[PDB]
Design an enzyme around this catalytic site. Structure first.
Site, PDB file in Angstrom:
ATOM      1  N   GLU A 106      -9.868   4.254  -4.653  1.00  0.00           N
ATOM      2  CA  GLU A 106      -9.685   3.301  -3.572  1.00  0.00           C
ATOM      3  C   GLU A 106      -9.536   1.887  -4.124  1.00  0.00           C
ATOM      4  OE1 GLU A 106      -9.362   3.118  -0.296  1.00  0.00           O
ATOM      5  OE2 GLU A 106     -10.079   1.065   0.072  1.00  0.00           O
TER       6      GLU A 106
ATOM      7  N   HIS B  27      -2.379  -0.529  -3.036  1.00  0.00           N
ATOM      8  CA  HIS B  27      -2.445   0.941  -3.276  1.00  0.00           C
ATOM      9  C   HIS B  27      -1.068   1.433  -3.647  1.00  0.00           C
ATOM     10  CE1 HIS B  27      -6.437   1.519  -1.586  1.00  0.00           C
ATOM     11  NE2 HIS B  27      -6.088   1.047  -0.398  1.00  0.00           N
TER      12      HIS B  27
ATOM     13  N   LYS C 103       0.846  -1.217   0.000  1.00  0.00           N
ATOM     14  CA  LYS C 103       0.000   0.000   0.000  1.00  0.00           C
ATOM     15  C   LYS C 103       0.881   1.267   0.000  1.00  0.00           C
ATOM     16  CE  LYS C 103      -4.103  -1.834   2.246  1.00  0.00           C
ATOM     17  NZ  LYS C 103      -5.072  -1.514   3.379  1.00  0.00           N
TER      18      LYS C 103
HETATM   19  C1  LIG Z   1     -11.330   0.663   7.003  1.00  0.00           C
HETATM   20  C2  LIG Z   1     -10.180  -0.107   7.590  1.00  0.00           C
HETATM   21  O1  LIG Z   1      -9.197   0.451   8.077  1.00  0.00           O
HETATM   22  N1  LIG Z   1     -10.307  -1.435   7.558  1.00  0.00           N
HETATM   23  C3  LIG Z   1      -9.125  -2.210   7.857  1.00  0.00           C
HETATM   24  C4  LIG Z   1      -8.734  -2.843   6.539  1.00  0.00           C
HETATM   25  O2  LIG Z   1      -8.375  -1.874   5.557  1.00  0.00           O
HETATM   26  C5  LIG Z   1      -9.227  -1.861   4.407  1.00  0.00           C
HETATM   27  O3  LIG Z   1      -8.969  -2.999   3.578  1.00  0.00           O
HETATM   28  C6  LIG Z   1      -7.828  -3.029   2.678  1.00  0.00           C
HETATM   29  C7  LIG Z   1      -7.054  -4.295   2.489  1.00  0.00           C
HETATM   30  O4  LIG Z   1      -6.238  -4.348   1.503  1.00  0.00           O
HETATM   31  O5  LIG Z   1      -7.336  -5.299   3.264  1.00  0.00           O
HETATM   32  C8  LIG Z   1      -7.605  -1.869   1.995  1.00  0.00           C
HETATM   33  C9  LIG Z   1      -8.529  -0.676   2.242  1.00  0.00           C
HETATM   34  O6  LIG Z   1      -7.936   0.510   1.692  1.00  0.00           O
HETATM   35  C10 LIG Z   1      -8.894  -0.522   3.745  1.00  0.00           C
HETATM   36  O7  LIG Z   1      -9.904   0.464   3.994  1.00  0.00           O
HETATM   37  C11 LIG Z   1      -7.624  -3.873   6.716  1.00  0.00           C
HETATM   38  O8  LIG Z   1      -6.502  -3.207   7.256  1.00  0.00           O
HETATM   39  S1  LIG Z   1      -5.063  -3.132   6.485  1.00  0.00           S
HETATM   40  O9  LIG Z   1      -4.152  -3.849   7.355  1.00  0.00           O
HETATM   41  O10 LIG Z   1      -5.161  -3.785   5.189  1.00  0.00           O
HETATM   42  O11 LIG Z   1      -4.879  -1.625   6.351  1.00  0.00           O
HETATM   43  C12 LIG Z   1      -7.973  -4.867   7.809  1.00  0.00           C
HETATM   44  C13 LIG Z   1      -6.822  -5.849   7.978  1.00  0.00           C
HETATM   45  O12 LIG Z   1      -6.996  -6.602   9.164  1.00  0.00           O
HETATM   46  O13 LIG Z   1      -8.221  -4.135   9.023  1.00  0.00           O
HETATM   47  C14 LIG Z   1      -9.394  -3.318   8.881  1.00  0.00           C
HETATM   48  O14 LIG Z   1      -9.746  -2.719  10.119  1.00  0.00           O
HETATM   49  C1  LIG Z   2     -14.293  -1.910   1.781  1.00  0.00           C
HETATM   50  C2  LIG Z   2     -13.460  -2.647   0.728  1.00  0.00           C
HETATM   51  O1  LIG Z   2     -13.676  -2.527  -0.491  1.00  0.00           O
HETATM   52  N1  LIG Z   2     -12.454  -3.393   1.216  1.00  0.00           N
HETATM   53  C3  LIG Z   2     -11.621  -4.190   0.295  1.00  0.00           C
HETATM   54  C4  LIG Z   2     -11.866  -5.674   0.456  1.00  0.00           C
HETATM   55  O2  LIG Z   2     -13.151  -5.903  -0.112  1.00  0.00           O
HETATM   56  C5  LIG Z   2     -14.067  -6.611   0.748  1.00  0.00           C
HETATM   57  O3  LIG Z   2     -13.594  -7.945   0.870  1.00  0.00           O
HETATM   58  C6  LIG Z   2     -14.337  -9.128   0.506  1.00  0.00           C
HETATM   59  C7  LIG Z   2     -13.557 -10.325   0.230  1.00  0.00           C
HETATM   60  O4  LIG Z   2     -14.086 -11.452   0.341  1.00  0.00           O
HETATM   61  O5  LIG Z   2     -12.351 -10.184  -0.057  1.00  0.00           O
HETATM   62  C8  LIG Z   2     -15.681  -9.092   0.500  1.00  0.00           C
HETATM   63  C9  LIG Z   2     -16.365  -7.774   0.817  1.00  0.00           C
HETATM   64  O6  LIG Z   2     -17.669  -7.824   0.234  1.00  0.00           O
HETATM   65  C10 LIG Z   2     -15.513  -6.622   0.232  1.00  0.00           C
HETATM   66  O7  LIG Z   2     -16.064  -5.360   0.549  1.00  0.00           O
HETATM   67  C11 LIG Z   2     -10.799  -6.416  -0.346  1.00  0.00           C
HETATM   68  O8  LIG Z   2     -10.936  -6.017  -1.723  1.00  0.00           O
HETATM   69  S1  LIG Z   2     -11.471  -6.958  -2.942  1.00  0.00           S
HETATM   70  O9  LIG Z   2     -11.617  -8.261  -2.364  1.00  0.00           O
HETATM   71  O10 LIG Z   2     -12.837  -6.343  -3.385  1.00  0.00           O
HETATM   72  O11 LIG Z   2     -10.563  -6.921  -4.076  1.00  0.00           O
HETATM   73  C12 LIG Z   2      -9.377  -6.062   0.077  1.00  0.00           C
HETATM   74  C13 LIG Z   2      -8.296  -6.792  -0.722  1.00  0.00           C
HETATM   75  O12 LIG Z   2      -8.315  -8.187  -0.497  1.00  0.00           O
HETATM   76  O13 LIG Z   2      -9.236  -4.668  -0.112  1.00  0.00           O
HETATM   77  C14 LIG Z   2     -10.175  -3.924   0.650  1.00  0.00           C
HETATM   78  O14 LIG Z   2      -9.945  -2.548   0.461  1.00  0.00           O
END
Ligand SMILES: CC(=O)N[C@@H]1[C@@H](O[C@@H]2OC(C(=O)O)=C[C@H](O)[C@H]2O)[C@@H](OS(=O)(=O)O)[C@@H](CO)O[C@H]1O
Ligand SMILES: CC(=O)N[C@@H]1[C@@H](O[C@@H]2OC(C(=O)O)=C[C@H](O)[C@H]2O)[C@@H](OS(=O)(=O)O)[C@@H](CO)O[C@H]1O
Ligand SMILES: *[C@H]1O[C@H](CO)[C@@H](O[C@@H]2O[C@@H](C)[C@H](O)[C@@H](O)[C@H]2O)[C@H](O)[C@@H]1O[C@H]1O[C@H](C(=O)O)[C@@H](O[C@@H]2OC[C@@H](O[C@@H]3O[C@@H](C)[C@@H](O[C@@H]4O[C@H](CO)[C@@H](O)[C@H](O)[C@H]4O)[C@@H](O[C@H]4O[C@H](CO)[C@H](O)[C@H](O)[C@H]4O)[C@@H]3OC)[C@H](O)[C@H]2O)[C@H](O)[C@H]1O
Ligand SMILES: CC(=O)N[C@@H]1[C@@H](O[C@@H]2OC(C(=O)O)=C[C@H](O)[C@H]2O)[C@@H](OS(=O)(=O)O)[C@@H](CO)O[C@@H]1O
Ligand SMILES: CC(=O)N[C@@H]1[C@@H](O[C@@H]2OC(C(=O)O)=C[C@H](O)[C@H]2O)[C@@H](OS(=O)(=O)O)[C@@H](CO)O[C@H]1O
Ligand code: CA
EC number: 4.2.2.19
Length: 481
Positions: free
Chosen positions: A308, A247, A225
């Site tokens: 995003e 990201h 990211k």
């Molecule tokens: C809104 C938020 O902070 N949710 C945390 C997650 O972050 C979202 O998901 C991801 C991702 O790649 O998983 C990317 C988005 O830009 C975020 O809004 C995710 O945290 S992080 O470690 O990826 O930053 C999960 C992981 O445990 O924690 C959520 O609280």
């Molecule tokens: C809020 C958001 O878009 N978070 C991203 C994750 O998306 C959620 O994850 C899944 C899932 O099974 O992975 C189901 C939920 O309906 C989604 O809102 C996820 O992104 S992705 O899976 O759509 O590509 C993570 C990356 O693994 O990134 C978060 O930002």
């Protein structure tokens, strides 16, 4: 000096001078609170290590903070932990939290430490917002993590709902020769490594020569990211997840191995958001791919530019090999229905990957899997450029003419790729060489003092009974009552 108790360790670390060496006598250091505030100097680091690595255990309600600069922590085994579950959070400091720059954690073992949610190691901002830079995490083993958050977070901003054009500063860390094998948690549970938070952050971290073996924590093996991180020569063996440019534009992955060699689970793989990347000389041989993502080796995100869920476009995909992938080699529009929902909600323009430069890639199948090499439900003639690829063994699945002459296959020479400032790799040279070497083994990354691989999950895909019970208790307390 040699110290043999918590109290004596605390005292000697308050006094130690640049170039100093603190050796911890054989034993167990229970509930140890090691806070190192003093600093070494360039060429005169302060080293805190086990006198005999393998004989020092940090256990109980423990924590380490490296707050000074030029410190080295070496040869510690973290196990049998018992930190307070109400006192630790995901996105907070790790069990080891590095707050100063020029610090190194090496040849340490973290094995099913406790039930408290946090990373095992972080780089963390101080309260005044200062960002640690130039740290290294190497030759460490991270196994059977049963708690939420990543194994490692490398931070250059405080977590925020964000979206203001000013990103975190370049970190210049290195994570190398580490071993990751950790069980699947529910949901968006935290993966292997997170670097940065959002697309304006600059990373410039090097992640090389790690072995991720059933790194299964959540969907993302690495959630990269920030901009300009370089992933070179890592092995991802039977991992239930993908290595992600999540990201941040202009990231680099060269000569990594993505291997799936049984049918137990779907494996990955890379999922790519954003633009200007260099994805070259990677080897993908996946016996099973991930249903929920779209069953592919390489996933190119559709969506809105620089959002995003940033559109994948305008990048170089060169000299990679896709060998017997049980899935598409490349999926050009995964999760498109969810992405159209996101774009509609935010009044953003939905787009699909284009301006891809696909050069010198090998696409080959001789096993009876059923997938054509490509899936592009939004194919438009001319939107991407294909040169010097070879494809043979199954239909392409899109209308693109590719040579089928494997004997004539050669990687392409590339000379226009700018290196990443602060990372001493010659990207043109490495890309032009093609795929070198082979998957890494445990013996090639292990702590120097540790012959036997720790953990219960890596070889079995199941936690041992006692660790499984603890994991169930963590999952239960983290979900709805
Ligand atoms: C809104 C938020 O902070 N949710 C945390 C997650 O972050 C979202 O998901 C991801 C991702 O790649 O998983 C990317 C988005 O830009 C975020 O809004 C995710 O945290 S992080 O470690 O990826 O930053 C999960 C992981 O445990 O924690 C959520 O609280
Ligand atoms: C809020 C958001 O878009 N978070 C991203 C994750 O998306 C959620 O994850 C899944 C899932 O099974 O992975 C189901 C939920 O309906 C989604 O809102 C996820 O992104 S992705 O899976 O759509 O590509 C993570 C990356 O693994 O990134 C978060 O930002
Ligand atoms: C990560 O590591 C993996 C391997 O673990 C790499 O895997 C390969 O590539 C993958 C893509 C494949 O999947 C896999 O199959 C592999 O093919 C991967 O590329 C990544 O590489 C990076 O990490 C490597 C690593 O850490 O292992 C880096 O390799 C190291 O590079 C530095 C080497 O040190 C130099 O050479 C050694 C032998 C020392 O020099 C000798 O010094 C002697 C005594 O002074 C002398 O008699 C000899 O004449 C010298 O040749 C070392 O010198 C330095 O240290 C010495 C003391 O030992 C002195 O203090 C010197 O002053 C000092 O300079 C050399 O340092 C330059 C090391 O051997 C090598 O392991 C790789 O470069 C990274 O890209
Ligand atoms: C604390 C540490 O080892 N940091 C890594 C950094 O190494 C420092 O910087 C350099 C240098 O030549 O720039 C050399 C020394 O090894 C150390 O002072 C460097 O690690 S590397 O040297 O193993 O490659 C970077 C990667 O560029 O990662 C950390 O910042
Ligand atoms: C502890 C943890 O990170 N669990 C993830 C869930 O996040 C928790 O639960 C919820 C919730 O509203 O259900 C919100 C908080 O973020 C946490 O207390 C949730 O992650 S996320 O969606 O918030 O990013 C789920 C999503 O699948 O993933 C669990 O791992
Ligand atoms: Ca995630």
């Amino acid at each position: 000096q040699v110290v043999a108790s918590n109290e004596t360790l605390y005292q000697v670390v308050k006094e130690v001078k640049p170039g100093g060496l603190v050796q911890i006598a054989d034993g167990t250091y229970k509930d140890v609170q090691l806070i190192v505030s003093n600093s070494g100097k360039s060429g005169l680091p302060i080293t805190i290590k086990a006198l005999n690595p393998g004989k020092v255990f940090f256990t109980g309600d423990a924590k380490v903070e490296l707050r000074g600069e030029h410190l080295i922590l070496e040869g510690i085994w973290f196990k049998d932990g018992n930190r307070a579950i109400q006192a630790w959070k995901s996105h907070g400091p790790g069990l080891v939290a590095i707050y100063g720059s020029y610090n190194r954690i090496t040849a340490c073992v973290f094995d099913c430490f406790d039930e408290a949610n946090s990373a095992y190691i972080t780089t963390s901002l101080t309260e005044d917002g200062k960002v640690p830079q130039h740290c290294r995490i190497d030759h460490c083993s991270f196994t059977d993590k049963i708690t939420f958050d990543q194994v490692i977070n490398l931070n250059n901003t405080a977590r925020a709902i964000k979206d203001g054009s000013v990103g975190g500063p370049a970190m210049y860390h290195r994570v190398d020769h580490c071993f990751f094998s950790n069980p699947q948690k529910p949901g968006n549970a935290g993966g292997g490594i997170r670097i940065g938070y959002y697309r304006n952050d600059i990373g410039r971290c090097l992640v090389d020569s790690n072995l991720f073996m059933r790194q299964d924590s959540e969907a993302e093996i690495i959630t990269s990211k920030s901009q300009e991180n370089v992933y070179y020569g890592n092995t991802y063996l039977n991992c239930q997840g993908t290595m992600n440019f999540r990201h941040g534009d202009h990231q680099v992955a060269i000569n990594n191995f993505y291997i799936g060699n049984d049918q137990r689970f779907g494996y990955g793989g890379m999922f790519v958001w954003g633009s200007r990347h260099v994805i070259a000389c990677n080897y993908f041989e996946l016996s099973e791919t991930i249903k929920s993502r779209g069953n592919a080796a390489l996933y190119l995100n559709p969506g809105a530019m620089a959002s995003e869920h940033a559109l994948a476009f305008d990048m170089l995909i060169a000299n990679n090999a896709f060998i017997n992938v049980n899935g598409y080699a490349i999926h050009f529009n995964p999760l498109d229905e969810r992405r159209k929902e996101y774009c509609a909600a935010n009044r953003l323009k939905f787009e699909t990957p284009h301006q891809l430069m696909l050069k010198g890639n090998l696409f080959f199948k001789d096993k009876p899997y059923v997938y054509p090499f490509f899936k592009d439900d939004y194919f438009i003639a001319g939107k991407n450029s294909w040169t010097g690829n070879v494809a043979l063994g199954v239909e392409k699945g899109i209308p693109v003419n590719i040579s089928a002459n494997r004997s004539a296959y050669k990687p392409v020479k590339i000379k226009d790729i700018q290196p990443i400032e602060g990372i001493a790799l010659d990207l043109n040279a490495l890309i032009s060489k093609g795929i070198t070497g082979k998957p890494l083994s445990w013996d090639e990354v292990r702590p120097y003092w540790l012959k036997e691989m720790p953990g219960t999950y890596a070889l079995t895909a199941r936690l041992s009974a006692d660790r499984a019970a603890k994991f169930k208790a963590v999952i239960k307390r983290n979900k709805e009552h």
